[PDB]
Amino acid sequence: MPGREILVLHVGQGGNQIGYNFWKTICEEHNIDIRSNQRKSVEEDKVDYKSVFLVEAPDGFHPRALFIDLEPLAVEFLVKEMKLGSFFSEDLMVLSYSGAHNVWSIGYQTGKKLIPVILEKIRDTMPETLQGFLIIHTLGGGTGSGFGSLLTETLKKEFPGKGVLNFSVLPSEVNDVTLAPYNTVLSLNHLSRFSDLVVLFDNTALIRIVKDQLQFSDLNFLIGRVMASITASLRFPGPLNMDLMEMAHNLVALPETKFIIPSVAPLTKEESEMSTELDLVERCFDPTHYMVNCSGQGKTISSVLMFRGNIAFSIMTDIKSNVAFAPGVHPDLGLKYGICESAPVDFDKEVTLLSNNTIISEVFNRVLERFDSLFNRDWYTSDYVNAGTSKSNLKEARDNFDRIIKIYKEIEG
């Protein structure tokens, strides 16, 4: 069935390593074996939107994806360590071997020399009904931050009629590299201008959720499961079946409030049996299960909830009451939910929540403080200016980043 095709772009080491469990989950949920490119079993549901993310070739199924990196480390993990070279094939790879050295500026400039090849691969291989792009990358490093920002800017300019969606991973607040605040602010500034929707993931939060319920390749593994769950409304029929622009409209009230906090429940099969339906819905609105490190509840501007599996009104009334919404949103509005018949392969039921919440200003404020604690003392700036990002550029991106925090702060009250 032609239509609603999406091209996924993995940029940087973290973004490509996430692609393993992201594409394995999507393959398994669509009755597809990622190791052989073929269907798992004869059991096939009569309606299935596999073509949204998967290309059907005569030999089998392949991901509609490009794997872009300035070093071959993450690609070697996919092909050599995981032995999935027939799925992550060489025709979908755009690689250099110079590296970004964890500097946003280096990934932006060096990635420009790969832009012509990427744009030609898109126009040569993508269908005309392609609805948009999904960019998966981290913000703390150099490639995923800089090259990812470059790709977000390039795809919006070259394809104005198509949506650009970002799944962006935030650095660890307490245990991450020195240059992470600079790269994060630079990336978030670029995404606010050229992205249609930015779904944020924070390594600080994912570590918290796993420990409190109870191996780096186990974090990106768990991020892929969540990223796949967020795209479920794009891949299955139901009351919440959306496309890229519908997903954006239902959350972006103002053009600047495009940063989304996702939450999912359950996260481990030990919690799956240990939890009922509303246990998962209450945990989705609980800031402990937010994919970004939040301290409080926060005001909800717009949110989209989804049930998956066998769930079978009573859920909404008691929950919508206890949820703090932004001033001026309607009491009958601000929250949309629905049931999806498809379920994750590991859990009998699952609840996902995408929330445009004002508490993201608190998350962005901590990023700004770490940025200022280094920038006000001219620390670690020497290699950004040698790569084409002046000290004045770091400030302008910072001030533009602060304007975003204030917009969310005004909507809160």
Q: Does 143 bind ligand GDP (CB under 6 A)?
A: yes
Instruction: Give, for 215, the enclosing helix (H) or strand (E).
Output: none
Q: Which is nearer to ligand GDP, 197 or 219 (CB)?
A: 219
Size of the site for ligand GDP (CB under 6 A): 24
User: What are residue 304's DSSP bridge partners?
Assistant: 336, 354
Q: Which is nearer to ligand GDP, 180 or 186 (CB)?
A: 180
Shortest Å, Cβ 123 to ligand GDP: 26
Q: How far apart are CA 265 and CA 358, in angstroms?
A: 21
Pick the piece of the chain touching ligand GDP (CB under 6 A) from 141-149, 279-287, 327-335, 383-391.
141-149
Q: How far apart are CA 147 and CA 412, in angstroms?
A: 33
Q: Which is nearer to ligand GDP, 82 or 100 (CB)?
A: 100
Pick the piece of the chain touching ligand GDP (CB under 6 A) from 89-97, 119-127, 140-148, 367-375.
140-148
Q: Does 219 bind ligand GDP (CB under 6 A)?
A: yes
Q: How far apart are the first and last CA of the chain?
A: 46
- As to burial, measured by CB atoms within 10 angstroms (0-12 exposed, 13-18 middle, 19+ buried), residue 214 is exposed
> Helices marked H in 333-390 — which ranges?
360-375, 382-385
User: What are residue 124's DSSP bridge partners?
Assistant: none
> How far are the Cα atoms of 101, 342, 376 from residue 394, in angstroms, in the given order?
18, 45, 11
Pick the piece of the chain touching ligand GDP (CB under 6 A) from 136-144, 191-199, 244-252, 276-284.
136-144
- Strands 54-57, 60-63: pairing is antiparallel
Reading the block at residue 62, the tokens are 């392949």
Residues 349-368 that bind ligand GDP (CB under 6 A): none
Shortest Å, Cβ 246 to ligand GDP: 28
- What SS3 class is residue 50? helix
Shortest Å, Cβ 19 to ligand GDP: 10
- Single out the residue of 63, 171, 309, 334 in contact with ligand GDP (rule: CB under 6 A): 171
Cα angle: 196, vertex 402, 413; to 5 degrees: 85
Reading the block at residue 138, the tokens are 């981290």
Q: Does 176 bind ligand GDP (CB under 6 A)?
A: yes
Cα angle: 259, vertex 207, 11; to 5 degrees: 50
Shortest Å, Cβ 397 to ligand GDP: 17
Q: Are 256 and 404 in contact (CB under 8 A)?
A: yes
Pick the piece of the chain touching ligand GDP (CB under 6 A) from 7-15, 186-194, 242-250, 260-268.
7-15
Q: Does 138 bind ligand GDP (CB under 6 A)?
A: yes
Shortest Å, Cβ 17 to ligand GDP: 4
Q: Does 184 bind ligand GDP (CB under 6 A)?
A: no
- Single out the residue of 21, 131, 195, 203 in contact with ligand GDP (rule: CB under 6 A): 203
Chain residues binding ligand GDP by CB under 6 A are 12-14, 17, 100, 102, 107, 138, 140-144, 169, 171-172, 176-177, 180, 203, 216, 219-220, 223
